[PDB]
Swiss-Prot record, chain A:
Annotated glycosylation sites: S30, N404, N463
Protein source organism: Homo sapiens (Human)
Taxonomy of the source species: Eukaryota, Metazoa, Chordata, Craniata, Vertebrata
The protein, known as: Serotransferrin
Modified residues (Phosphoserine): S361, S639
Keywords, sorted A to Z: Disease variant, Disulfide bond, Glycoprotein, Ion transport, Iron, Iron transport, Metal-binding, Methylation, Phosphoprotein, Repeat, Secreted, Signal, Transport
Mutagenesis or variant effect for P561S: In allele TF*C2
Chain's gene name: TF
Disulfide bond annotation, renumbered to this chain: C7-C46, C17-C37, C116-C192, C135-C329, C156-C172, C159-C177, C169-C175, C225-C239, C336-C368, C346-C359, C393-C647, C409-C610, C441-C514, C465-C638, C475-C489, C486-C497, C554-C568
Swiss-Prot record, chain B:
Annotated SUPFAM superfamilies: Variant surface glycoprotein (N-terminal domain) (SSF58087)
Full protein name: Transferrin receptor subunit ESAG7
Protein's organism: Trypanosoma brucei brucei
Role played: Transferrin receptor subunit involved in receptor-mediated acquisition of iron from the environment by binding host TF/transferrin.
Membrane topology reported for the UniProt record: Lipid-anchor; GPI-anchor
Gene, per the UniProt record: ESAG7
Record has Iron as a keyword: no
Swiss-Prot record, chain C:
PTM description: N-glycosylated. Glycosylation is dispensable for heterodimer formation and host transferrin binding.
Stated induction or repression of this protein's expression: Up-regulated by low iron levels.
Glycosylation-annotated residues: N7, N91, N216, N231
Keyword rRNA processing included in the entry's annotation: no
Subcellular localization(s) per the UniProt record: Cell membrane; Flagellar pocket
BP-aspect Gene Ontology terms: symbiont-mediated evasion of host immune response
Record protein name field: Transferrin receptor subunit ESAG6
GO annotations of cellular component type: ciliary pocket; plasma membrane; side of membrane
Length: 652, 313, 323
């Protein structure tokens, strides 16, 4: 049926909910979504009721969103509250570490400094900083308060016992848990830093802007980043400790009425949301403050379906809380494999390297990026289009694949390969412009030469994203299985249009096979035709093919032989790079360089001569270059990546 | 962290397989122990024929009751020997059940191995335990045909190891193994067979109940996730959702209780039969004459047939 | 892809077979009791013949009774060998018991593990048609009460003892679990979303982020045979241990006599039965020779009166020589 049992943790919350149900009943028909309320003693009895299929939804702060994801509860974020303008909705806050300009210490130099905290046991003022600095704290780390007092050289942690931990009140004697304590809360924690009492303030991104209106006054302040560098207070999105969701609606991971919660809460915000009805208000009640939802909310947003608790909260938030709860404190590299073909090869690599490289399988590339992100795997080799996505997901590039013959391959950076449009010499009617209503063969959707470059140049022409309407049919592995762009694929049953080697037309060679057998245009790297023609590929289909029988489509409606690629390419493509978790650069760089010197395109492109070093280019923007990022950006409207949609919901 | 999936250590696997082949050997043990009793009984037949030869040639004076009890023994014993062999089949069968229960568990874990990184039986490396690491489980390449059969090589020599059932059971207790030698902690070997939480035995949900491998050897709560925190305890000692418990008292495990009960029973019957033969042998001896006593087994039977065929005709 | 489960009808027939195998212990015990009955009857008849010789009641010779001298020598020696054959037969009786106990433990561990693999939201590894989990109420051949280690049938339970009392033979009971008798629809069950990983060898099934590519996982001793990348859809075809492929169907046994664990039970129980029958034939043919030369007076003599009158006669025949 269509009822959502909402969990109320008090008497006043339970009556606002009876009013919520009754007001909904008055504006939604019998068939539609309905609320029903369930009363519980605490938020933990709520998380428990949902998990035990008694209730369906409850709104929670980040700390509780963590406890609800753990087993045996296994709940997940489904809907979020937003604050401020519809243009820039403020779903998340940024926990920052504010300092004074030129005090000259980094995150790794906090020991011996004077700290200012919002309060003991508060999220950005205590839980996040102390959770991350956990292993920098002296032994014995228990009680935590003793360890914090022996780390800093004087603090102000309001709501802490000054009788037991006097160093924690040195800056605000008494550790007063009210606004009567000048250094209490965000304004006080900032005041503690402003008055020169402390050297660091654990606050939110907003605090400085709420306390200093003058940009010249704020200029005398900086933030501490985790990379052990400082940045201006207005660069908080690029320099923070954690990115934390404000208030989130949670439901069961399996059989939780996710779409029925969304329907009800979207309908609710349209009738009784911010400045809508004189009758009922969703974000206000006479019976109390922050009942069911925060009063400050402007409404709701759907959480992308790919989003899981760990990802939603972020690696930083999860890492800090794990350290606080667990207390657990101190190679080899887990390589992600793309289906059974890559895994077969990865297995030989695992035993031969004798426990230097380990393996994990995933059916898609974005599933693998997601394994890297959380920790299920550590690294994998990606194409340019997937470096953009993987990077936007927080991951970084560590080694670049080099393809040119060089003296010192390892330290000679390359400009990239070339994206080309391959036709048969026989189909002489074909011109770059004469492609409408014809058959295409893509490596996979989201790939540089196969997708992002030709579909970007097509989008700049037809000014629409229906590429399946433009072509008659084709094979672009990764597309919707009911699209015309999956009709020319060769995959067996479910394996049809799959973005792995189970699909016979996936990849550079696969797209070339597509052109020979079914298609009339293939989108690949400049060296695909030579690598398969003239016997070089022993496979039945390729064995007797010669490169003299294939041509290239030039942007000026011209055709040239495959060898004349230099002046008949769609665009230059950034080289495939090995991406990893920021906190793994060093080890991967070390073991891959070590490994590389010791030892289809399985794991790496078969034309890789070696893995080359990166310098100041340790970011996707820096690695791919200003030009490629701009071209991928122009295709955001046409995106189908459920992972990109999720990652940009946190960092647009 | 929570997605962490530990593997059973090979030394804990071999120790279970060791017990499993001791239990297969119980059939050979009851057969051998029953062969002793027949030796003791044949000595009674050789001593009664020794008496009949004296009879057909003090306080032994009553000839009637000597031969009435002798004919009685010929029947009274075989119906009590029937009773001991009946107990031997049950002790041999009940033992074989416990052997199979432990075998399926370890064998399934041994087969759930995949090239590198993910497997259920570990040796510390990123390579699953192979037949050479599982020497007490398999006699070559891992498979159904390489597991030890009851007539097999080591089952027979296990049956003569002078080890007692109570000692071999102790060998797989939590103390005897040690907390760090049972499971490989702090490692993600992807073995879903040791996970009751969602993404384990079931892909999206915790179990509705506790779970056990063996019949109470390895025990899990309804929602075990991450680093396995093994403690000593039994199937009943799983209180929380997180609980992992390896047997501290193997004689409290379901499948072993019947092996103890029924082997003790056979021994109880075997000992009762043994004493009966001893008390009979001792009372027949005081009637046998020295001429017939010093007589060798071969000629003793030749002489009986002589007086036997004399009296018939 | 559909996510199906092992069906309760397959599980129950597999459990039925396991309780039959536990009952083999009782079958060999009853069968041996029939032989000791036959041998005790043979021992009685030879005293009756000995009495007839002493009392000169042995017939003049209808059949060849004129050579009681030799036909008694051979009977008293055959009686001695039969005692050694009984012991050899009982040794086989314990090995048949153990071997069957093994096969049963293997099957019981298999099914029990699937029975326990059950949770909320219709997620289970044993179905009751297109639903589940199967509870102890279903699966009554497996369990005595709510699913657990103490509700599995033990060797002395009435169910085991009563299954040993039937006229059912090993081959009939083995065939009950073959792909032929069962059929696809009695093996695969559930809704298309019961999340059973024990039945998926593809990635995230038995192994997380991997598949058992080194070994073709088999449950039973080769009853249910997996390859390396099985869906979890429970697509089944008939076949044996070496038949499973990487992407193909699960192979369910076509011939249960070809499974590792049943091969020994058939072999060892056959050895018992052959040994038993051979002793019974020999006892019969010797008793055929005895009942001929006894005489109604000595034939009617039974139980306690047989020993009484025999000792009465041996003491008289000894005083006949002594006087
Ligand atoms: C790199 O590749 C281009 C391809 O045309 C070639 O001209 C150039 O000489 C190569 N560089 C080296 C150092 O080989
Ligand atoms: Fe590419």
């Amino acid at each position: 049926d269509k009822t959502v049992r909402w969990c109320a943790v008090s008497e006043h919350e339970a009556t606002k909910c009876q009013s919520f149900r009754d007001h909904m009943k008055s504006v939604i028909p019998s068939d539609g979504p309905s609320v029903a309320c369930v009363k519980k003693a605490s938020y933990l009895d709520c998380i428990r009721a949902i998990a035990a299929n008694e209730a369906d939804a409850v709104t929670l702060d980040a700390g509780l969103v963590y406890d609800a994801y753990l087993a045996p509860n296994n709940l997940k974020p489904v809907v979020a509250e937003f604050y401020g303008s519809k243009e820039d909705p403020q779903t998340f806050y940024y926990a920052v570490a504010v300092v004074k300009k030129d005090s000259g210490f980094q995150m790794n130099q906090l020991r011996g400094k004077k700290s200012c905290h919002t309060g003991l046991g508060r999220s950005a003022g205590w839980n996040i900083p102390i959770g991350l600095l956990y292993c920098d704290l002296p032994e014995p780390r228990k009680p935590l308060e003793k360890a914090v007092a022996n780390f800093f050289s004087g603090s102000c942690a309001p709501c802490a016992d000054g009788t037991d931990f006097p160093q924690l009140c040195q800056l605000c004697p008494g550790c007063g848990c009210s606004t009567l304590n000048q250094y209490f809360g965000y304004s006080g924690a900032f005041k503690c830093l402003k008055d020169g009492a402390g050297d660091v303030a654990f606050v939110k991104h907003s605090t400085i802007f709420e306390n200093l209106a003058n940009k010249a006054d704020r200029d005398q302040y900086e933030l501490l980043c985790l990379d052990n560098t400082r940045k201006p207070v207005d660069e908080y999105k690029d320099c923070h400790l954690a990115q934390v969701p404000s208030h989130t609606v949670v439901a069961r991971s399996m059989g939780g009425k996710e779409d029925l919660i969304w329907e009800l809460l979207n309908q609710a915000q349209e009738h009784f949301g911010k400045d809508k009805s004189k009758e009922f208000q969703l974000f206000s009640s006479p019976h109390g403050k922050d009942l069911l939802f925060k009063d400050s909310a402007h409404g709701f947003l759907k959480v992308p379906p790919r989003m899981d608790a760990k990802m939603y909260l972020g690696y930083e938030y999860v890492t800090a809380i794990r350290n606080l709860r667990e207390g657990t404190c101190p190679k080899p590299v887990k390589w992600c494999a793309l289906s059974h073909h890559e895994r077969l090869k990865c297995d030989e690599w695992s035993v031969n390297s004798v426990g230097k490289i380990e393996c994990v399988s995933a059916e898609t590339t974005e599933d693998c990026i997601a394994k890297i992100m959380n920790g299920e795997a550590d690294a994998m080799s990606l194409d340019g289009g997937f470096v953009y996505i993987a990077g936007k997901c927080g991951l970084v590039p560590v080694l670049a694949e080099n393809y040119n013959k060089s003296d010192n391959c390892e330290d000679t950076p390359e400009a990239g390969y070339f994206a080309v449009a391959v036709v048969k010499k026989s189909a002489s009617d074909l011109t770059w412009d004469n492609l409408k209503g014809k058959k295409s063969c893509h490596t996979a959707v989201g790939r540089t030469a196969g997708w992002n470059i030709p579909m970007g140049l097509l989008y700049n022409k037809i000014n629409h994203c229906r590429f399946d309407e433009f072509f008659s049919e084709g094979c672009a592995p990764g597309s919707k299985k009911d699209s015309s762009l999956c009709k020319l694929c060769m995959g067996s049953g479910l394996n049809l249009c799959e973005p792995n080697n189970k699909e016979g037309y996936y990849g550079y060679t696969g797209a070339f096979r597509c052109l020979v057998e079914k298609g009339d245009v293939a989108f690949v790297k400049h060296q695909t035709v030579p690598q398969n023609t003239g016997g070089k590929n022993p496979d039945p289909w390729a064995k007797n093919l010669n490169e003299k029988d294939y041509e290239l489509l030039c942007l000026d409606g011209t055709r040239k032989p495959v060898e004349e690629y230099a002046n008949c390419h769609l665009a230059r493509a950034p080289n495939h790079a090995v991406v990893t978790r920021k906190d793994k650069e060093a080890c991967v760089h070390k073991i891959l360089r070590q490994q590389q010197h010791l030892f289809k395109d399985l794991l790496f492109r078969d034309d890789t001569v070696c893995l080359a070093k990166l310098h100041d280019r340790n970011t996707y923007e820096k690695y791919l270059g200003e030009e490629y990022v701009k071209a991928v950006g122009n295709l955001r409207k046409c995106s189908t990546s459920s992972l990109l949609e999720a990652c940009t919901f946190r960092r647009p | 962290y929570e997605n962490e999936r530990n593997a059973l250590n090979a030394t804990a696997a071999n120790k279970v397989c060791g017990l499993s082949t001791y239990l297969k050997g119980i059939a050979h043990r009851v057969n051998s122990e029953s062969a002793v009793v027949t030796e003791k009984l044949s000595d009674l037949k050789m001593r009664s024929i020794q008496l009949q030869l004296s009879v057909m040639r003090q306080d032994c004076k009553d000839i009637r009751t000597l031969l009435k009890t002798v004919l009685r023994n010929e029947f009274t014993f075989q119906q009590e020997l029937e009773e001991m062999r009946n107990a031997s089949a049950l002790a041999a069968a009940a033992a074989g059940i416990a052997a199979g229960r432990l075998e399926e568990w370890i064998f399934v874990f041994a087969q759930a191995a995949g090239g590198s990184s993910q497997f259920c039986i570990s040796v510390g490396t990123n390579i699953p335990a192979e037949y050479n690491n599982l020497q007490e489980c398999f006699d070559g390449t891992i498979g159904p045909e390489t597991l030890y059969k009851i007539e097999d090589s080591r089952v027979k020599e296990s049956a003569q190891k002078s080890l007692q059932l109570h000692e071999v059971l102790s060998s797989i207790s939590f103390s005897s193994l040690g907390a760090e030698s049972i499971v490989e902690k702090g490692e993600n070997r992807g073995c879903n067979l040791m996970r009751t939480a969602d993404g384990g035995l079931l892909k999206d949900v915790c179990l509705n109940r506790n779970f056990t491998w063996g019949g109470g050897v390895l025990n899990f709560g309804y929602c075990v996730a991450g680093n396995l925190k093994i403690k000593g305890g039994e199937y009943g000692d799983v209180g929380s959702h997180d609980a992992v418990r390896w047997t501290e008292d193997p004689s409290k495990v379901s499948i072993f209780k019947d092996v103890i009960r029924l082997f003790a029973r056979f021994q109880e019957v075997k000992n009762a039969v043994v004493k009966k033969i001893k008390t009979t042998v001792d009372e027949l001896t005081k009637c046998i004459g020295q001429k017939e006593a010093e007589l060798t087994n071969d000629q003793l039977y030749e002489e009986f047939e002589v007086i036997q065929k004399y009296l018939w005709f």
